[PDB]
Every structure is written in structure tokens, then in C-alpha cells.
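Notes to self after the Tuesday call (sharing in case useful).
The group wants a holo model before anyone commits to mutagenesis around the pocket. I volunteered. Ligand is zinc ion. Logging inputs and output together so the record is complete.
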Amino acid sequence: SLHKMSMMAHRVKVIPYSTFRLNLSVTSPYNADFDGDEMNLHVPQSEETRAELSQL
Amino acid sequence: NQEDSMIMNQSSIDRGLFRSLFFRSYMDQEKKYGMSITETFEKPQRTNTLRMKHGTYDKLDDDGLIAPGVRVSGEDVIIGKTTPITAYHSKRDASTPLRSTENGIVDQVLVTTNQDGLKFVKVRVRTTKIPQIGDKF
Amino acid sequence: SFNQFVDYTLQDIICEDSTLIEISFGKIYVTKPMVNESDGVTHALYPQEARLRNLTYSSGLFVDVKKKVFIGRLPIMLRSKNCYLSEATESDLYKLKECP
Amino acid sequence: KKLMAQIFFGPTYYQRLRHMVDDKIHARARGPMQVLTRQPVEGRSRDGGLRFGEMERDCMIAHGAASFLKERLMEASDAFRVHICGICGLMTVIAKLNHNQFECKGCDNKIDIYQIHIPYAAKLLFQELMAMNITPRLYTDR
Amino acid sequence: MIVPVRCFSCGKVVGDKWESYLNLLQEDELDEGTALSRLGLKRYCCRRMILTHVDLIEKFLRYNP
Amino acid sequence: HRLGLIPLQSMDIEQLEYSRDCFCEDHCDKCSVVLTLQAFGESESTTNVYSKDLVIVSNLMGRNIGHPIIQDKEGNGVLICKLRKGQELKLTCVAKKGIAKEHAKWGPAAAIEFEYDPWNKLKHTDY
Amino acid sequence: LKYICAECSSKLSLSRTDAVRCKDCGHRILLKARTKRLVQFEAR
Amino acid sequence: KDQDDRDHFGKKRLDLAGPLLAQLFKTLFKKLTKDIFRYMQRTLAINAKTITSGLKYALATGNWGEQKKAMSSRAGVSQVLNRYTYSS
Amino acid sequence: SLMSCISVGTDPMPIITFLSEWGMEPLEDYVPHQSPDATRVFVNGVWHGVHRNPARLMETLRTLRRKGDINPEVSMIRDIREKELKIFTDAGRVYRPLFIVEDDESLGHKELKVRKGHIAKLMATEYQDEYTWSSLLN
Amino acid sequence: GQQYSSAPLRTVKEVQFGLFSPEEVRAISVAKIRFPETMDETQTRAKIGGLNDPRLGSIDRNLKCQTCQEGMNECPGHFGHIDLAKPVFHVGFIAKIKKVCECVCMHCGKLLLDEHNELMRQALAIKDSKKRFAAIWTLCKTKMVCGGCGNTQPTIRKDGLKLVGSWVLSTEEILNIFKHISVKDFTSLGFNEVFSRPEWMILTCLPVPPPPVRPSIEDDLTFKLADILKANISLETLEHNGAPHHAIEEAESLLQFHVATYMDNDIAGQPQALQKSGRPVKSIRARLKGKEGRIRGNLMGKRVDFSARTVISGDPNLELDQVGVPKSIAKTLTYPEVVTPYNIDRLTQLV
Amino acid sequence: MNAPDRFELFLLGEGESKLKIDPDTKAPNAVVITFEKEDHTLGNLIRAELLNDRKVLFAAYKVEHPFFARFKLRIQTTEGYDPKDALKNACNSIINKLGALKTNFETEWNLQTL
RNA sequence: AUCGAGAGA
DNA sequence: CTCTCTCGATG
Ligand SMILES: [Mg+2]
Ligand SMILES: [Zn+2]
Ligand SMILES: [Zn+2]
Ligand SMILES: [Zn+2]
Ligand SMILES: [Zn+2]
Ligand SMILES: [Zn+2]
Ligand SMILES: [Zn+2]
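Result:
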């Protein structure tokens, strides 16, 4: 995580298969390809913090 | 198939393209102590053994092992071993569970004494893996 | 490298460095890979049986002492001179469950 | 319908690598903790969590999300409640709960006591500093 | 392992053509191309499927267990 | 898996039924065709196991179905396996009606050649 | 239950308090026999 | 004449199984004859487990030079044979 | 690399004896001012004295190695412009096999010692399975 | 959560660092540490009244823990204490102490230069403690002769874990010296009134960390404390009984060694004090040093719950601010949602 | 692992209807029909047959995601012409053409050898 | 769990 | 001064 664009809040879309599916145009800020790259996902636990994610 | 990813023909996959066999061996051994204290291979009951595993032991036999051919999955128990440390609950559980995330079929079970005269066992489980979305090529 | 170690280096290590005050060390003998079981019966160890039973594919060293004796076990590199597989043919390897 | 551009098409020797998704995929929602630091264990096979490292913290700081950073560093990890003496400010307090008996051998404190929420790792650090002849006195006032 | 039953790409049966292929190679003394041609393998995917295959089961059968 | 890809007779398949549609338990004779396979190493030489060795057990009751297609010249068919000397393969096969959309083993066709306008007079392709 | 030796075509039935070795052989490598309860395979 | 090239491969050596096992066996055997010297001065009863367990340890852990963490050969001299592919 | 090998290590003593018995002045009997153009001979990093007329010695040694009398593993370095002769019987030296080019060809020029006959014998050994690599080395 | 406490919930506003005065050390303690025995005593699954007392914290999944009970999940850590036969040096202060001995002459206990000097007036004008000490240390270590007591101040140099003199300084001697520097001289070189004194830098008696710091599955800290207690009892034995001149000193240096290496194990001194398994042992200093340390590894960043990790792939049919989440992960990761009239139906369906 | 069942490509799930007709809010006299358990095979054909009807203003199908076997079909017809009738006419036309094609292929097959 | 080793981007 | 799986020997 080199800059703030390495951690960004997304909307969940539950899909089949075992891969984190992301939009192509979001590749650049994360600096990632799909040649085996792995990513992490964190889930908020209260209203104020998910508000922090959605509004910031 | 952008940014170093690829699209594979599902039909060809069904016909056996890039399919694989995956074998995994678990090894266990009966421990020995100075006062002739020895762990034993068996299928323990919940009323006679401490701790135990959350998984089921019903696939075990009298010798505390699985018969090669029985399908295993989740947190099933592959090897049943107990260690003693009248009184209720005289045995501690030392059973080995199948990998929490893996599954498959018991390919082949091997029972053999050690160089120090210790009865130890290697259980090989087989799982066929089929090329899926996300597999590295 | 391993063959050089067995056929020459070992004797140099034993003889040219050690002498006590007396007991002088003589020739070194390297056997074929064997196992002294808990049964007491010592028998020939083959690589497949060694890997299956978590044993150590090693031979025994025997030195002549003056004024014979077992001094330890040396792990044997596979397909070396003191290995059974070096002289074995393809059919022999197939019988010994060793891949050709 | 035909494709305009023609496609480079032909046999090529490909190979399947060892890295497969079902061996990589991992997810934990409240699992086994460690003993020393009381933080989520390390590894997928042991049902562990993922390290919210220094750089992630830096990113959350950059965003400004404070409550999120607090949530990752408390509720999502090791959230511990400790008692502090209102005098010296150390974890000397002997809190006899269910009897409301908050004792403190050394300053004779029974009425002037405090209660704070800190990470168990912070508690560990403070205790280790106390074992290294240092007093991390914690006051709750300016 | 053993000769794949059908071609991955299109789906044409090829598992019944292995021994015939071998015979066309050793008995009639033909090259691989013509042998593959005579077996009705015109598309290079099936042609590949047979030509590229390595029969490893013959080595596997050498063991007694 | 190899058995799954074996081509079977699907002539009167239209008077066979989906196991998911049949009112039986698991499978029956109105939905599925059962064929056995018993092979054993006999000779010192390699004993080949083909698709001809498959033997229909279930009751076809008139319908042309279940019979393994053998376009082989020697009449063997698909080479299933190879047995050594004392090796044995004893199994049973329940074949059911299926769509190639569900699995490519139910594919009735191989490669379908397809071409329109060989002169590119429509100009659908920029060469 | 019953077992089968590795480097020979035998069929030992020695349960617990027996184990190694083998009947008319001498090797201590014993494999376990296949289960009687059959397992199905979705031929796909 | 310019400075010597310290990256010249001709002025470098590769120690294989031979030299390594030679150093190790020299150590373990000197230890053995030392122990035997002790048993002799205390007064056929020779501890063969020294050489065996020594070689086995150094070959198992990859930590060349018996059980002393002061070794700089902690970079794993002996490793598990990678058997994923024949080429591997 | 595919053909690279590691020197096992041999005994330099017979090479030393050969040198001394083939016109090598002992280092203890070396007078620099009366023989400046004397090539100093090194063996395993040891100066065993100098030697005048180094070419004949070098050709002799090379001939012996190529014959087999001296272990083919042993390396022999002749530095002309530095007037030095370094023979290494050291172990751990990484070497590789090479074709030998000699100009002993009368009706021709500088050609490979290995000829199509040798290759034919090699492939004869290949088809039969008595003429192997060691024969090429000897 | 845990349990209801009568104490108010407050936020940490300030952190006042300082030293641990032996008085406060023994006053804070709730258990004396005499026996070096760990837990078992003559085939008994319990705790001896020496090390790992039940007062320090019970360790057997019990419901009791030193009268206060509250199990072992609520109980933080109850410190102990051990008295040393002779005072020793705190390793992390070896430099600082060695500097103070150069800022104040021996025997007496006074600063060399005062307001009578010209440069000292300028050096003592700095308000910052560090800069003040750094300024005075340079303009005071050159003084040899001296308030009165004109004793020739020796040249002190560092050697191992003791100090020498050139006209060997005992630890008790330096204790007696730092005990007589008084209050006014403390402010002149950084130290504080009732927080940090030079007479507290040296270790008279040292605190004993509770079992939650050194757990058992024993911990290295338990072994090191056992070594310290061993050297202590050995020193006491050599002192009370037959006390040779060149024997008890070795025991003093031994206790000093074990105490010094109990905190810092990576010193300039070659003896790194290995263990039984050949391990260089884990000191308290090594527990904090990053990046795998306690601070950078357990405080600045730590493993968290409600997290997932997977191989990523591109999807042209997902929006920019969308993320594809595998169904299994969706079932695994969860969110606590309070029941309200707006969502009671949906939540009921989900349940 | 997380891979969906294959039959979910052609077997209607629990409660899932075949066609979902929805009134389009954008353009007047338009409709969006959701086809379940169907791919391009049906959508392309229907859409191509809806462009033959000269009383149909708009006709376009799309598969929103390849994971799921379903496609949306938007149809806009002239006033005084219900789009359902356009879909029905298209379908019937398809069926007729396929019937004639089948008959012709059969007759042409009977006249062959080998 | 504590130290070494291989590997992922 | 330098995010993951993993193996395999050690207590
Ligand atoms: Mg990448
Ligand atoms: Zn207090
Ligand atoms: Zn094909
Ligand atoms: Zn039925
Ligand atoms: Zn047998
Ligand atoms: Zn308590
Ligand atoms: Zn003075």
C-alpha cells in the first residue's frame, strides 16, 4: 500500500467462482495485473465506519 | 482476458484439458515413553476421550484408520490416536483431521513399524483438480 | 564428488589425523546400506523402503584398530558406488519400485 | 458474423502452474487468537486473519477515516479493558469485580480508580516496559 | 498416461485410433503425418491430440503392485 | 472420466427420459441405461480394456440405445484401459440422458465447418 | 481388519496387537485393503 | 597491471557433497577420537551415535557443522529435493 | 550449464616430480639476475622454481593430459607475456569440455581433430546400444 | 464484551515515562520470589511459593486467581519482585550512568562548576533537558579537582559491565554516590523529582513480570528469571557462608551478567548468553525491536478479523466502484445488524 | 468450490419464471423482456427476426453477464401494435422457416448415397 | 508457537 | 535499514 488509492471502498457484488472480480479501470491505482495477483478485503462492523468508507 | 489473464474453452476443460491428480500424505506415529507409556491407534468414543475433534470419526475403522476408497471432506478425521495421561476420561485425543479447506478420496493407507519399533502410518489422499477461473497458467 | 569422498577422502580423514596414546587406526570399510531393526535382525535397506518407512539410507563404517569396530553410519548418495541402484538394470529398478 | 481483423491462431505449448485459487482463497470472521498477544493467528490453514500492516494504517490516515482505523485496531483485533490507578498511573490495580473492590497496594487507592480500553498488545508493551524498570504512567487528564 | 479418448478442441473420438496409429508407424512404415491423415485426422487439433501424446501407461505397467 | 466420454447409441434417445424428470428413485429403465464392465489381466502380455467390453445390463425394452459406438476397424472401439497380469477392473456404469450444454461428453457433433461469402463481397473482414 | 503386503501378493488379516511383518516374506511394509462400501463417480 | 578481478569465476571454487561431508566427518571423527581419549584415560565401548546422529542432523536441518548456531552456514546447505517436475 | 563439471581433485606430487625431472630449476637454486627470462612454474598456488624453454614442457604436459597420463581434470595455464606457468590440481574448479583444434593437417589447414569417422563410430555405439566419450577424451 | 465495572470509562490523555524506584517496586509487588522452581514441586501439579505464584496469576483455566478471582481472561497481570544480594547496573543506562559519574565528582556529590563559572551559567540556561545534559556533560568531564571536598576526580572508562577508576568502582559505591546528589542537582541534568532519579537507574530490586508476559505451552523469560534467581541464591550462599575474596566477586559479576542480558541480549559484549537448546534466547529488547517487534508488528499494524484474501480477475461487466466477492467469502464474512422496524422482516428471512 | 451447477444454465430455478415482461419507462410503447436460462442462440435469432417486421421501431438483445444464462430483449413498436404480438409473429415466423428447412433438408437427404 | 529454507507480485 | 502462502527440521 504505497498511496491512499491502494485502499478504496467498493460496493459488494456477490458472484460465483473463487476470484475477486474488479473493474479494469481500477487496475491503475491499485497497480495490479491478473497474472496471479492477490488482494485483501476488509469489512466494517458499525454504521459510522461503513459511513466513513462510503463517504470518504 | 485483459492485464495478463486468459479465457479458456470450458468444453475442452470438460474433455480433460489441463486436469490434474493431487496426492497428499499425512504421517502419524505412536509415541513411546520411559515407563512403557504408548499412544495407540483406535477409533475413540466421546465418553472415553478428552477434547476430541469437531469433525466426525464415523469413517474410521477398528484400527483407527480410513479404508482407501472412502470419500473425505471438510474436517473429517483420517487417523485416530489417543494418549493416556478408576477415573472418567482417561484418554487425550491426538487424532489427525483432514485439511479444513481440502477434500477428496483416500487413495492408499500405509501401516509400518519404525526403526525404533514404533507403529506409524502414512495416509495418502487423492483429489482430481480441474482448471477453474483463477488457476495460474 | 561423493565417490571421491568415499574412495579416498574418508581414509585420509581417519588415518592421517588420528592416533592415540596406544591405538592406531587402520583401513576403513564402507558396507552396503543396511538397517538394524528393533527386532534385532539387521538387513539390507533399499531406497524405496527407506523413504516409505522414514528410515535413513546409510551404510556402516568399520575401522581396523591396533595396539573390526563400528564407528557410525554414513548416509549414502543414491546411484553412487555403495548404492544398490548403481549396478541395477532397468528391470531391476522397476522391481525395486525405483523410477528408471 | 465474421471478425474484421484476423486472429493469430495456432498450437502453443502451455503449462499449468501450482498456484490455484482454491488453495489461495481465504476468509475469516472472528477466529482463533494467539496466546501472547491475543491477536488473530497466522496462516490460512489455521484459520487466521490478515495483517493490517503499517502501510494500510498510513493509507487510512491519508483518507482520514479515524473510526475505521480504531475499529481495525480494537474490535477487529485485540480489544482489552484495563484498570488504572488514579495516583501513580500503572496497572497495579487489583480489580475485584462483582464486589466492586478496586484495590491498589502501594498507594492505598480504593475510590480514585479508572478504566480504559487499549489493545492487549499495548498492555503487553506496558507490562514489558514495567519489567524493564520503566514506568509508562497513564493519566486520563490534561 | 494413456491416449486421450476424445480431442479437447473439437471433440472427435481419437482414443480408438492409437493402436492403429502405432501400426501405421511400424507395420506399414509410414511417417507420422500420413499415419495421422489415414486415420481421418484432418484438423490439426486432433492431429495434435494423437501426435503430441506420450503413452506413459506402458511404463506404469512395469510395476508389480 | 474416460467412461464419461465414451460415445453411446442415442438413436431412440427421444423416448428415453431425464432422470430429473422421471418419477423413480435415483434411476430406472425409463430414464437410464445400466452397463457393466468386468476386466482382468489374464495373459502375460498387456490385457487391453476397450469400449466393446462394456455389457448392457438394464432392460432396453425395444429401444435402440446404450450400445457403445464402435467405428474401429478391428471392432474394439475406444481404448479404455490397460491391465498388467493380475490387475482387475470391476465397475458398473449408469448412463443418463444429458445435454452438451451441461457437459461436453453429451456432444453429438464434433467440428461444424461454417463459411459465408468466400469472396468477402460483403466486406465483413478487413484482410 | 485385513491388510495386504507391498512387495508380494498376499492377504494378511492380522488385526491389532500383530501388525508387522508379513506371512512368508519378511518385509514390514503393509498397505490397507480397499473398502467394501462402494463409492460413486460423476463421470464428468 | 590493473586491479585483480574478484568476480573471476576461475579464481572461485564449488564445494559439493565431497568437501562438505569431509569437513563434517573430520569434525565428528575428531570429536569421536576425543571422546574415546576420555574413555581411555578414564580407565570396545565406542560411541558410534556421534558420527551417525551428527551426519543425520546436518543432512536433515541443512545447518552444516553439528549443533552450534554460531555457524554461518545457516543458509541451508541440504534442502528437500524438489519433485514437482522432472525438470525441477 | 549442461556440460559443466566440478574438479574432484587429484595428487599434484607426480606432476611435481615430473617437472623437477624435466628441467625445472629448484626455487632455492634460482638466481634472478642470471636468468630473467625464466618462466616461473606454479602448482596449486605454490612456486616450485623457474624453467627455461617453457614451450617444450607445455607441449609435453598437454600431450600427457590428452593421452591420459595426466588427469584430464588437471588444468594447465601457460601465460606467455607474463612468463608464468600455473598448473592447478585444485578441487572445486568448474570446467567444461571443448573440441581440440590442431594444425597437424598436411593436406589442409587448422582443422578439428575429431572427424566424421569418430562421429560414425559414436552413432554406431548408439545404434548398437564400444566407442564412448572416454575414448574421445583419451 | 467482558463485564460491567463500577469504574468510569476514561481516555488516556498523557503518558509520563519514568524510572522504577525500588521502594515503589517492592510496594507494588504482591508476591515475593524466593524459590527458583517453576511450577511443579515434588511431583505436584501446582505452584511453589517462589516463582509463578497463584498470586501473580493462576494458569490452569480456573475460576480463581489471587482472591480477586475473575478467571484468567479478565485478570491482566499481577507483578512480583525480587531483591538482589547486591545492586547491579541497568544495561540500557550503562552509558547515561557513566556520564553522570563524570558530571559529579566522587565521595562528595556536587556539580563541578556553578554560577561562579561563566560557561556553566550559559550551559545551565537551556530549558530542554537533553540539550542541557549534553551541554553540561562536555563542559564538566574535563574537571579533575573541585561547596568543597577537593578530591581528584578519576578517569572513568567502560569495561564489560563494571566501571574503573584512574587517579574499579563498585555498584554499591555508585549507589551511595547517586544517593547524595540531592534534588537541586537533578534538575540541572534532566532528571525529575518523584519520577526519575539516578539513584533508581541502578537495580536494587527488580520487578517480576506476570505469567501473561511469559506464558507456557516454558517461556525464555522464565528461564532467564530462573538464572537470575539462581545467581542470586548462589551469591547469597557464597556471602553468608564461606566468603573467599576472589569467589563472591565472580558471583556478583554473574548476577550482573544475567540481569543485564535479561533485558538486552544484543550488546557489544561477545557473550550472548545462549540457552539449553543452543538458542541465543529472546530478551525483552528483542521483543520490541521491529519490524517483527511488538511496536511495529502488534501495535502499528496487526492481524484483524472480518478480512478476506483472493486471486483477482478483471470483469468488463462490473462497475468501477464494485468488487466481485466469491459466495463462500460472502457466507464467511459477516456484519452485525441491529433489529429495527425497518428491517425486521428481511433480517428474519436471513435468519 | 464456488462454481455453480451446470444445469443452472438451462433449468429454471426456484420461482424463476421463463419470461419477465416489463414496461419500459424511457421510450413510449416499449418493453423489456427478461429471458431466463437462454443465451445468444435464442436472443440473436429473435432480435434478427424482429428487424424484419417493418412495424417494429427498436429491437435489441443483450447478455448482461456471461456467468448467468439470461438475456434482456428490448422491443419498441409503432402505436396501435402491441410488442407481444411482434414477438409472437417473430417466433411463429422462425418456427415456420425451421419447419420448411427441416422438410427441405429431409427431402434433400433422401436423394443421397453413401 | 521459536529459528532456518523454498516460493508468490 | 529491508505482504503472502508454504514446506521441515527443532524444543
Ligand atoms: Mg503480477
Ligand atoms: Zn498506584
Ligand atoms: Zn479436434
Ligand atoms: Zn427413472
Ligand atoms: Zn510379503
Ligand atoms: Zn487476578
Ligand atoms: Zn568531591
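Two things stood out.
Residues 31-33, 35-38 of chain A lie near RNA strand L (CB under 10 Å from a C1').
Residues J 57, 65-66, 68, 75, 78 surround zinc ion (ligand 6) (CB under 6 Å).
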